[PDB]
Design a protein around this ligand. Structure first.
Ligand SMILES: [Mg+2]
Ligand SMILES: [Mg+2]
Ligand SMILES: [Mg+2]
Ligand SMILES: [Mg+2]
Ligand SMILES: [Mg+2]
Ligand SMILES: [Mg+2]
Ligand SMILES: [Mg+2]
Ligand SMILES: [Mg+2]
Lengths: 129, 107, 97, 287, 250, 85, 87
């Protein structure tokens, strides 16, 4: 009516993991999706931008009122004011006018008016974050 | 139980040479030039150095400031700052008082 | 007149009784204990209220269906009437539609 | 850090000192005082002020906007319609690049879900995963993928790299099980058998174009080749490569999991799998 | 033999570990018996005072149930009939004697039934709460690390006079790893002491840490706290409650 | 306050302590059983499921009896189960 | 003081007492017993044999399947006839 076996490898395959895996070693970078690991050793600057859980550059579009468009840089530690002035000098030739920035030094974030998510991601990747 | 000891500290005159002695003990007799540059990355040696200084000087590096002691110069600069320990009544009473002023204390 | 004419007896609050001392211990039962229990399993009180929150109307609906059978005749009549009241109040009355 | 050094100087953090973040807590307005007291933001006396306003959508008498419009079947049978969650090739590639979805093994629903590649709500009329054209270029990986729906272009995209794609139907009762197997294992029930498609989806899965799981494997090679002509790529021989065995593996139409045959029970606590022996039961599950 | 301790869990590249002195309860002059490295993410994160407030307020309020109720006009006894006709007399018109206006009447808007104030802050927020609280303790020289909570004697006056000698302060929170494997000597001592409190690791919370002037931890417990709090970031979103089996959780 | 047991259980609960406790087992079991009468005034649904002509989706069905009133004169005779509706 | 010993799960499976009227319908059911086996194993749970259908239940399952889920042969057969009518 019943028989018992230990052929159980298939059930083990079904169980998921809690920890997000470390990205495996690749032949060269960038990858086909465009993902690139951070430069080692880390770049010698006053400020540092740490990645997200999924190993991405923390840059996010944001909207309010359905007309205010913003860009956010998060997970910033060290002298954020330095990152501010760097972002300032980088974005100013693109806009003509100097961009208007909010600095949240307690939170450790930088908010910029308008969408510059793609440009800023590129720029931070270049810098070695 | 021993009596509670004062938190008051005055840095000695021969701090430089005393630190010379302690470093040359722990890191060995052979000592490279610019000994201030010696890194305290090694955990064991850090402990040994700071223990000797703590036991003799009476003053210890607190838990808060320990990671700041990266290099030997950092230890030297830490011990040259004085701590004077007295209640605020005592400090005000002998603080060049004008004769018209009077302070009393009801604690 | 209607104001006291002497000072009341002074109240002394023992901040270091056992209940005050161990206040809020095991609130981190979940994250620190492998998620065996939710903190909502530290809540004591009414059957219909352990680890749930709602307005008056919702609380009444819930008490009706959870301890409705077991409650006293006059209490239950009061509760059935409450629900009737609140139903009309919330659905048919107010500033905003 | 600098902030921590500032704390060295400041008096102890205690239950006295704590204050909310400015802007988080907005104080409440009460109908007291002189400003908010008389009439208390209700206007002068009328239907409005007494709080007996008519219900929403009442236009004061005239036939309301919503009523006066004709009825039309925009949502006539909305709950019965099937929904497929889309997986882009971009998404799939990015999952493989971060090692979240494993190429050395076959992909199915269960692997993707576990990978956090997708979210599937069986309850919300989801019937699995649709494979979409998006990011056909810069898709460079060789995988054995299992999806319920796929576009011809995405089939082409996978077969160009030397992968194998097939479409297999999942019934709702199978889907909830496959997406989250661990809860099902705790239900103590034996594994049921994956049901066959409904009448209108039989022609879909019995078709080599869509690469159905009930399509004739003899009709496969010419179909693969025809797609190779149309999109102008040299169709590679799968038999030659080392990973051929893996790309071969396909669960049978009545199988939900890879090793686990229907009617088996999993005892999780002692890591055993219990089989029936009874002829009646065996006949029932093997059908 | 000096007591050295390193961080087992991997550190970020840019961050460096903080150190703490290690002492034992065996002697009055038995400070500085060892040195320890602590994970910077748990023990040296940004001081976020808003978070402490958030977590503390959730801790105080989420368990609270209100027992206060009052009777409305409908629930007060009697008050059926109209007290007198509307038109006839000089009197002000009334419908019942139990109206809010009347003395002995029901309440207009009063406390209504058992009320629950239960809500849940997100997990990651409570985790971050614990982290901040721990950094803040070490930043302000209020945190101490011990090899073991082992006492030369169970005499409770020994523990008080040691805290006096070590400038701990009026209230000390003692944390051990497990409830069962807590030493005999510390349990005896702490049982009859008001201000000193012994808890297991799982007990630890923001409220107690803020309430007590000192936090004392063991080396077992410090590795344990690191594990769990650091687990919170660098995990996926759940598919189902974590009490259920995973391929790598417990 | 609350009663310990729901009020609807009291009829059952009282059978357990008094003269009813020491009644024979077979009688109590015959009293307990709650089986439904055969339909008399309603055509029952044949099957457990039925397809809806409205939407073409197969739906569960239940048989819901009409409540039947029996006047006391019915006790003095043999009505096949017919009562006043 | 010392902290009150920490909250825990009830160790091992719980069996409700069927004589008690307070015990709800779901606890006394066979489906509850199945779940106890799944969680706690054969070590503490019910007889493993019980987990499958009874011959009577299998009879009902066979009738259910025959009436609601047709064979692939007959489905293709139905399409063939109805599609042919279309031309
Ligand atoms: Mg937003
Ligand atoms: Mg006004
Ligand atoms: Mg007025
Ligand atoms: Mg009115
Ligand atoms: Mg009344
Ligand atoms: Mg009236
Ligand atoms: Mg009147
Ligand atoms: Mg009253």
């Amino acid at each position: 009516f019943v028989e018992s076996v230990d052929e159980y490898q298939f059930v083990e395959r079904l169980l998921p993991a809690t920890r997000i895996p470390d990205p495996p070693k690749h032949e060269h970078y960038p990858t086909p999706s465009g993902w690139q690991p951070p430069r080692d050793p880390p770049p010698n600057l006053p400020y540092f931008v740490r990645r997200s859980r999924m190993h991405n550059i923390p840059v996010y579009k944001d909207i309010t009122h359905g007309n205010r468009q913003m860009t956010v840089i998060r997970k910033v530690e060290g002298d954020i004011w330095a990152l501010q002035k760097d972002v300032e000098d980088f974005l100013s030739p693109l806009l003509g006018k100097t961009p208007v920035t909010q600095v949240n030094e307690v939170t450790g974030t930088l908010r910029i008016k308008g969408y510059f998510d793609q440009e800023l991601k590129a720029w931070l990747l270049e810098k070695g974050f | 139980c021993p009596p509670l000891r004062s938190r008051a500290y005055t840095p000695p005159e021969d701090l430089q040479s005393r630190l010379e002695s302690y470093v040359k003990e722990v890191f060995g007799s052979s000592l490279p030039s610019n000994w201030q540059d010696i890194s305290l990355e090694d955990s064991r040696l850090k402990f040994n150095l700071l223990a000797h200084l703590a036991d003799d000087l009476g003053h210890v590096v607190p838990n808060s400031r320990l990671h700041q002691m990266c290099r030997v110069r950092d230890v030297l600069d830490f011990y040259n700052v004085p701590i004077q320990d007295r209640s605020k009544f005592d400090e005000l009473s002998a603080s060049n008082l004008p004769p018209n002023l009077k302070i009393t204390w009801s604690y | 007149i209607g104001i006291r004419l002497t000072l009341p007896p002074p109240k002394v609050v023992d901040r270091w009784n056992e209940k005050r001392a161990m206040f809020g211990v095991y609130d981190n039962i979940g994250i620190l204990g492998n998620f065996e229990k939710h903190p909502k399993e530290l809540i004591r009180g009414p059957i219909w209220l352990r680890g749930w929150k709602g307005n008056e109307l919702q609380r009444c609906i819930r008490k009706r269906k959870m301890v409705g059978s077991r409650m006293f005749a006059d209490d239950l009549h009061n509760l059935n009437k409450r629900i009737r009241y609140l139903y009309k109040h919330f659905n048919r009355h107010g500033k905003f539609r | 850090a600098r902030a921590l050094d500032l704390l060295r100087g400041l008096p102890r953090v205690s239950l006295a000192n704590l204050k909310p973040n400015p802007g988080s807590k907005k104080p409440e307005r009460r109908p007291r005082g002189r400003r908010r007291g008389r009439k208390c933001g209700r206007g002068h006396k009328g239907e409005r002020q007494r709080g007996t306003r008519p219900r929403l959508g009442f236009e004061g008498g005239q036939t309301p906007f919503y009523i006066r419009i004709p009825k039309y079947g925009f949502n006539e049978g909305h709950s019965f319609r099937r929904q497929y969650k889309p997986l882009s090739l971009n998404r799939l590639q990015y999952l493989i690049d971060l090692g979240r979805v494993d190429p050395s093994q076959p992909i199915d629903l269960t692997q993707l879900v576990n990978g956090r590649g997708v979210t599937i709500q069986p309850l919300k009329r989801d019937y699995g995963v649709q494979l979409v054209e998006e990011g056909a270029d810069t898709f460079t990986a060789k995988v054995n993928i299992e999806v319920q729906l796929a576009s011809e272009l995405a089939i082409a995209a996978i077969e160009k790299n030397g992968g194998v794609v097939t479409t297999a139907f999942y019934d709702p009762r199978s889907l909830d099980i496959v997406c989250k197997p661990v809860p099902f294992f705790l239900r103590g029930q034996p594994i049921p058998k994956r049901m066959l498609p409904p009448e209108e989806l039989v022609p879909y899965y019995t078709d080599a174009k869509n690469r159905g799981y009930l399509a004739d494997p003899a009709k496969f090679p010419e179909a693969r080749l025809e797609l190779a002509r149309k999109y102008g790529y040299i169709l590679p021989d799968i038999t030659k490569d080392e990973l051929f065995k893996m790309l071969c593996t396909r669960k049978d139409p009545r199988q939900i999991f890879f090793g686990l045959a229907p009617g088996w029970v999993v005892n999780m606590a002692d890591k055993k799998i219990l089989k029936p022996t009874d002829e009646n039961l065996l006949k029932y599950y093997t059908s | 033999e000096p007591v050295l301790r390193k961080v087992e869990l991997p550190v970020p590249t840019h961050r460096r570990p903080v150190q703490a002195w290690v002492e034992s309860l065996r002697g009055f002059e038995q400070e500085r018996v060892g040195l320890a490295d602590l994970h910077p993410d748990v023990f040296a994160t940004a001081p976020r005072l808003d978070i402490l407030h958030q977590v503390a307020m959730w801790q105080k309020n989420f368990k609270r149930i209100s027992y206060a109720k009052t009777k409305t006009r409908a629930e007060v006894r009697g008050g059926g009939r109209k007290p007198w006709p509307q038109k006839g007399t000089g009197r002000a018109r009334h419908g019942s004697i139990r109206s809010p206006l009347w003395r002995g009447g029901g309440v207009a808007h009063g406390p209504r039934g058992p009320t629950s104030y239960y809500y849940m802050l997100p997990m990651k927020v409570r985790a971050l709460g614990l982290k901040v609280a721990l950094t803040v303790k070490l930043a302000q020289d209020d945190l101490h690390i011990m090899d073991s909570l082992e006492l030369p004697t169970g005499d409770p006056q020994y523990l008080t006079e040691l805290a006096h000698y070590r400038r701990w302060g009026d209230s000390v929170l003692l944390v051990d790893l497990t409830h069962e494997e807590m030493p005999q000597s510390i349990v005896e001592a702490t049982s009859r002491l008001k201000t000193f409190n012994l808890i297991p690791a799982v007990g630890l919370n923001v409220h107690s840490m803020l309430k007590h002037q000192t936090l004392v931890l063991t080396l077992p417990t410090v590795a344990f706290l690191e594990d769990k709090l650091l687990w919170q970031d660098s995990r996926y979103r759940p598919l189902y409650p974590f009490s259920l089996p995973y391929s790598d959780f417990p | 306050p609350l009663h310990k047991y729901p009020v609807w259980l009291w009829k059952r609960l009282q059978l357990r302590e008094g003269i009813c406790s020491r009644l024979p087992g077979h009688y109590l079991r015959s009293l307990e059983e709650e089986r439904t009468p055969t339909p008399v005034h309603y055509r029952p649904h044949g099957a457990k499921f039925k397809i809806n002509p409205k939407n073409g989706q197969r739906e569960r069905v239940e048989d819901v009896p009409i409540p039947i009133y029996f006047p006391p004169e019915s006790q003095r005779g043999l009505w096949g189960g017919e009562g006043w509706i | 003081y010392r902290a009150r010993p920490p909250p825990r799960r009830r160790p091992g499976p719980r069996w409700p007492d069927p004589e008690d009227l307070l015990t709800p319908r779901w606890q006394l059911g066979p489906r509850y017993a199945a779940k106890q086996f799944a969680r706690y194993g054969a070590a503490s749970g019910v007889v493993p044999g019980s987990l499958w259908p009874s011959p009577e239940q299998l009879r009902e399952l066979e009738a259910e399947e025959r009436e609601w889920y047709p064979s692939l042969a007959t489905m293709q057969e139905s399409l063939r006839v109805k599609q042919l009518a279309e031309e």
